[PDB]
Design a protein around this ligand. Structure first.
Ligand SMILES: Nc1ncnc2c1ncn2[C@@H]1O[C@H](COP(=O)(O)OP(=O)(O)O)[C@@H](O)[C@H]1O
Ligand SMILES: [Mg+2]
Ligand SMILES: [Mg+2]
Ligand SMILES: [Mg+2]
Ligand SMILES: [Mg+2]
Ligand SMILES: [Mg+2]
Lengths: 510, 504, 499, 503
């Protein structure tokens, strides 16, 4: 089932310097909670300054939902250390609150009570909140509290150079679409290794054969990542809207068409209700982020550009992988082993040939993802090519892919010096013979002993105590203070610069 | 530019009995006004009973907007007399109020608080009012006070037999009516030419090279059909095939409109409209002509077409005839019979929705400047080169043959007379309704002209005795109509907002 | 989710004559009701002769359940006209009674006294009635008065020439029909509502007292309808299938042994096995061969292989006086040919069971915006609209091949019309009949249609069959029954064993 | 509204090879600016030699307005690469200056003293500079700094040979021009990239940002508006070669009350060439222009009379802000499709006021082309056709021309382009102008210009040459300076007297 990539591997083995200079960035989300596991209802902590403008620390959907963002970086340890400093500083400046360490929250009784991220009174800040109001009304606040890690990745120019004019940005875009098509066909290996959400609170809910406990914890005995299942998110699958990844313009046209298509469903919600604005507009997507997407091509926008404008202007700059659950075994929710595996997998995805796929061939790649998501750890599980009958045992497919990943590891290890990528392959490949080594088996044992609540409360306490004692390593305290002051100032400035009232301004971005 | 219809007229001539028993019905709308021409703000005249259920008299958009409807019927004189009985009775039972005799209203500024039509508390009743709230909020109440005449028409089975057992019937009849419709779009501009009666509008309604005083265009026929009138394109709806038509129409009631969502579904707890889709219901699709089948109880217009095929055709493009106390007359009706039949005979290739947009070019010429000397028309979008009068005459040689045939089965010369009268309008546009009514409006204004005719027509009608309906028949119907409303208002279990949910 | 068929299609496109000579037949059932909508209690109308032996008109489960059957035939218009002559004649010869136009009845209470179909006094007659007694006692009479339409279909010899190979090819058809045939109730299901008499699921009730699911298509096919599996019948091999079938005839049932076989001399079933006879295996589609004298269906199959297939999924089309129309028949032609072209991997017993999951989704909520289908038991993934369009890309190609041997564009017109239903489930039979039932009720709607179709059908002249053909067939059928009745037949118990 | 072109398309699908060997050339203009966006006041960069005689690089109106010209070519990739080589070389040889990347400039004041292109002391040079002095005095220098791309196009002989000469070809290109007037507004719809205008250029419902930028919310190309690069009072028509040329030659002799008030001389300095409606024929500004390469100091109109229309010059392209060279393959292929379509569709002859009527749709698209529910009309008649439906009707035909070209070229590039561009008719937000407007509302014309100019300079300075070697630029620098020298030495009469001989 794994295709044959000997030509591309051989090519890579003869050009190791083509991989020198990979760039990465991490985003990690986590709810602020009290010791009892419930969402804090305090505001974004003072010491973090303005969530709207801050460089490293912001909020996602909810006021209690923190997001840490590392600046693009070529060194894995440097980037993880940076991430850990954000966590350390935050952990000691949020009063008695702490950070929820799983993707799935514990029982929440009233989704409707959750405060949306608040961004002040400037037009940009309100738009951002109104966007969330919109999401709240379309899909419910509850699902937005489920969190994850994004891993952002780009190959160096050297890679493309070893593989002229206006073609360059086109070859690069084509190669990233290749990576994306391959992620669709094979990326189920990610939730298999690192899925960490085999259980969900009944407060968040089916034909599924759930085991139940009296506190409302539901779980599937072999699942890997319910975060990625239909129960773990509410919005429209890019796959489902019929967006494809064969060609850049086509992709952008599909995306932009969704921004402009009105929706009968969302019009029923209404745009206003008692002088309170309820969504930005009533289109399928309010803005491009509303598209649910396990993986997404990107380019950093310039001032005023929409994300898709940037793509059209400059082609794909880098890939965002969104399918990683929070790593509950790391205080920062992600570790070196995961980052190195994604390096190897993404690189492999860029090498393997990937035929174009129509909407329904893409839909078929999801059959395997669903098997792995809901019962990836089942003894005897078999996978198939697209929709064809399942017939390849999962472990053997894993070992096949790792035969290749190991060759890429050898190449990366020889340029970085050391053995770090090879060790990672050996550690991970073992998970195909023993599914009990995977994150989701480990975290299910924990959740059976103490619940989602008990497991999250206990890690959150333990992690709070590491994080708040550890010395800052790269950022120092005065950097947090400086960035607090500067972020607050940029917010005062946007507030003062507005000249039109929100209603008028809105009528030109709605 | 008129197609060759020889083969079919010859067929018709050998089959005169095939046209025996054409069925017709008319609807005619008119605003209740005061002596001074302002809109009456009183309610639907007590004597008429329940607008909601009455068999012959109701309202349209506005509480003050009367509409008279005749039951389907095979006899022209009978139908016209019935319509007149309705007017007679009504004029005698509305105090000092009288009926505006023009299409275009006059004493109404933009956003005048025009009372929507009222139908009691029933769910069906409250839904109809809400539809109108929607229409008001989407288009303005003002445009909804422009009034017209609809002519409803069906060929007799004998016609289709003379050209089919079981399931075939339904298909052939439908196919013939879509032909009628396509031909109407190609050639129906002849209607506003002859009978358009709104070459002027009051300022309230207002690009075009107007003249002021009251706005008008010197050669205009029917502004009620222009963009400033009873009009409301981008829909892709075609007339080739029953299934395609219904699919397109059903698609439109399910299509959300951004513009309309921005009105809201309800503001401050007052429900502003049934929904925010392009059409709230299928009635909102304004069109010059429309295929129809009588709906079962609560069944939708498009369901009925899909179940039974096209039953009859509704021609919607007639302005009020200002020269008749009942707003329509025998000359118009007979011309429509002739033109509809011709539409059923002539070959009419299928049209894509952009070919249909091209047929509107001639309509637009005729609408805004149909009486211009030298005016020429084209085939669709192709360059104009056919002088209008020669096209009319050409059409009328065919209508003449159809008229001979109809006259030979009835007995008499009545249809031939109509051909001879109307064909003269092509040589002299000054004989057409719009030339004549424009002279009158340039001189006394839309206002003056309307009040005068209103007043004359009222006096005439007040004295005329009833002929088919007896006073007793209106009284029984008042009672039975009010009875049916109560019998509905009571039979409602669940409250409006929930019933709406299931039907919105 | 649709398999790739483009190779088989290309072959078909190079061999259009391989489809010339498709044969079809229809069966359509309907309750005889009074104008008030209650079930008639009179006997089979006498102008129709012997239900037991008549060639075209008979009864199904109940004495008031008419069934109309067309003789196998190559021409669509002709088959539908014949069906219509049967309706016309009957409508003008059943007194003030009329034909219920919907699959689901109302005005019939649970455990009401439904007279079983009566076939006179011969071995065969008594046997047919006894089998019904058996069904009544096993599953209840009520379920048996749900009516439907069966479409019977066979490919010409020409097709295969481009006999054990004929059977394997019809099994391919069945396998594909299980995996994908939910498209039929989606387009044509017409029983979204159900009388209370038939009562888990999120039903709505009307003040009127009517139950319904907002997005349902065909409750007739649901578990509350004409239904039921751990029998393990498979459709991979002719003999494999026939064996499974015959074992099912011989397998005793704990539950039915409980009913008794005799209680006070009245025999209560044919036997106490899971299936009394082969007909009892209810299924959406069924392999078939016309049976000889005293032969059983399986014997028939064993002798000559599958001759044709019977598609049993169609609800009564509420919008046609004869309960089925040309658009349906044309669609099934396309669908059944496609089923014969697509590769269908063999399927085990429980793989076949998994195909029900999609059926149930479409049945219970097929019109739900955003509905997704899966493959077998697996997680729903594929949006219903895209799946349908994919199938119609292929059917459109089949349609071109059929139009070009027949002349015209009739098959392609059907593709265009119906694909439109995937963009708007409000065009489907079930959205339409539901709107109407929500205003007036099952009863209301049924009575209104039944009355209009009565008046309509009584005024239409006969076209293929003359009144005198019905009289002859009445008399011949009456005579055929008398001759069987007067035969010196074997003792019943022995006779039974001999079946 | 779109004519039916079935017979011509059926004809084409039968004679595919009728289109093999289309010829194209591009002109692209750009201002030389500093990192701060202000107009560079240095001279024509030295590495480029003589703007007057150089073969590929020259100036337009202003000394700071660069212009790149590709030599006529049959290969699209080759042509684009060649244009790019010119840019690369220039970008490396202009100090810290860069190329302004938008049609509309931002940091240029009204009445700003812009240095006119300088061509030296030869009579020809001084004439060219004087022409500009004329334009400056007649319309202001500001307008002349708005820049554009020209797409030059000819069908191969194989095309005319199959369609049934010299007079047939001219009638064909006139049919192209009449079609272009009727339907060419499709160009600024797709590729207009100037929906905002700086206040320097200032009855229309303009919006204005706190920063001081004016714009129309649905506009496409204000470069084509009255406020842009425009001068039509002349009633020149496109029915017949001799009528066209007569109209044009007459225009050059017709005096103008307005220009006479300016004067021919003032305090010893000559102000214009004459005080006629057009000083010379180039002054006639239009969206499209019929052309022949002029041989032997012949005038453009002379060339046309001598040899008929050789090619078409489509002048209505704005600078593509999303391409370092101001134009991309997608635009070129679309213009191939649309010009070929314009040669195939029937085009009745048009009076000068029928021509004026075609301008009504143009203005609509120019000023509010992206407005939801905009409708177009035929000529001056009631607006009745929703633009999306019209555009899609057109693309049904372009798509068949596209199949033809792809079958003779191999591949699917032309069909891909139809699929891309047809999407703009369902979604105006894909068009160049919506994309550039979002960026301008936010950082203004200045901010957006500077930012793009900065990135393209970095990009181009790094790219190696691909078709021209550095030797070639050096070789042409020397050869162009020589020719100028020669022309300067070879002059006999002082310019004042030479000028009377070419009044
Ligand atoms: N088969 C038919 N042929 C001709 N006219 C008909 C037929 N059926 C109904 N009509 C007429 O059509 C008209 C319908 O009027 P109305 O109830 O006002 O409907 P709407 O307002 O929807 O057009 C009535 O005048 C009726 O007489
Ligand atoms: Mg283990
Ligand atoms: Mg009305
Ligand atoms: Mg039966
Ligand atoms: Mg059967
Ligand atoms: Mg030029």
């Amino acid at each position: 089932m794994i295709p044959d990539v000997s030509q591309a591997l051989a090519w890579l083995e003869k050009h190791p310097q083509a991989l020198k200079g990979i760039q990465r960035g991490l985003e990690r989300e986590t709810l602020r909670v009290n010791a009892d596991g419930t969402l804090a209802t305090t505001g974004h902590p003072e010491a973090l300054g303005s969530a709207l403008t801050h460089k490293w620390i912001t909020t996602d959907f909810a006021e209690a939902l923190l997001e840490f963002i590392t600046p693009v970086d070529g060194d894995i340890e440097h980037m993880l250390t940076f991430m850990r400093d954000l966590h350390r500083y935050t952990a000691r400046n949020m009063g008695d609150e702490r950070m929820w360490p799983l993707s799935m929250p514990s029982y929440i009784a009233e989704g409707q009570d959750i405060e949306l991220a608040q961004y002040g009174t400037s037009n940009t800040g309100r738009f951002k909140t109104l966007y969330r109001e919109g999401l709240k009304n379309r899909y419910g606040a509850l699902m937005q509290t489920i969190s994850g890690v994004h891993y952002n990745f780009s190959l160096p120019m050297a890679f493309w150079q070893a593989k002229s004019g206006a073609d360059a940005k086109e070859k690069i875009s084509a190669g990233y679409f290749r990576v994306i098509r391959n992620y669709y066909r094979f990326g189920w290996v990610i939730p298999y290794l690192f899925g960490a959400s085999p259980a969900i609170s009944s407060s968040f809910l089916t034909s599924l054969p759930f085991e139940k406990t009296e506190s409302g914890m539901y779980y599937l005995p072999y699942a890997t990542s319910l975060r990625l299942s239909d129960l773990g998110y509410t919005n429209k699958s890019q796959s489902n809207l019929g967006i494809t990844f064969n060609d850049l313009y086509e992709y952008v046209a599909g995306l932009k068409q969704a921004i402009k298509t009105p929706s009968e469903e969302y019009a029923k919600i209404g745009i206003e209700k008692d002088g309170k604005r309820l969504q930005i507009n009533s289109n399928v997507l309010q803005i491009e982020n509303e598209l649910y997407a396990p993986i997404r091509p990107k380019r950093v926008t310039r001032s005023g550009e929409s994300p898709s404008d940037a793509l059209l202007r400059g082609g794909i700059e880098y890939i965002e992988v969104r399918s990683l659950d929070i790593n509950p075994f790391s205080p920062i929710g992600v570790d070196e082993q995961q980052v190195r595996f994604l390096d190897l997998f993404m690189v492999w995805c860029a090498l393997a040939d990937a035929p174009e796929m129509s909407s329904s061939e893409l839909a078929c790649t999801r059959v395997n993802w669903n098997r792995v998501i809901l019962e990836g750890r089942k003894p005897g599980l078999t996978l198939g090519i697209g929709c064809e009958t399942a017939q390849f045992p999962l472990p053997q497919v894993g070992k096949d892919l790792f035969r290749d990943l190991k060759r890429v590891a050898q190449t990366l290890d020889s340029i970085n010096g050391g053995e770090a990528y090879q060790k990672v392959c050996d550690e991970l490949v073992a998970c195909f013979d023993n599914p009990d080594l995977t994150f989701s088996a480990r975290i299910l044992r924990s959740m059976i002993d103490t619940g989602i609540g008990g497991t999250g409360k206990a890690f959150a306490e333990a992690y709070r105590n590491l994080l708040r004692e550890e010395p800052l390593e790269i950022l120092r305290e005065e950097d947090f203070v400086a960035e607090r002051e500067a972020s607050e100032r940029r917010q005062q400035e946007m507030e003062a610069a507005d000249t039109e009232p929100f209603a008028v301004w809105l009528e030109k971005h709605a």
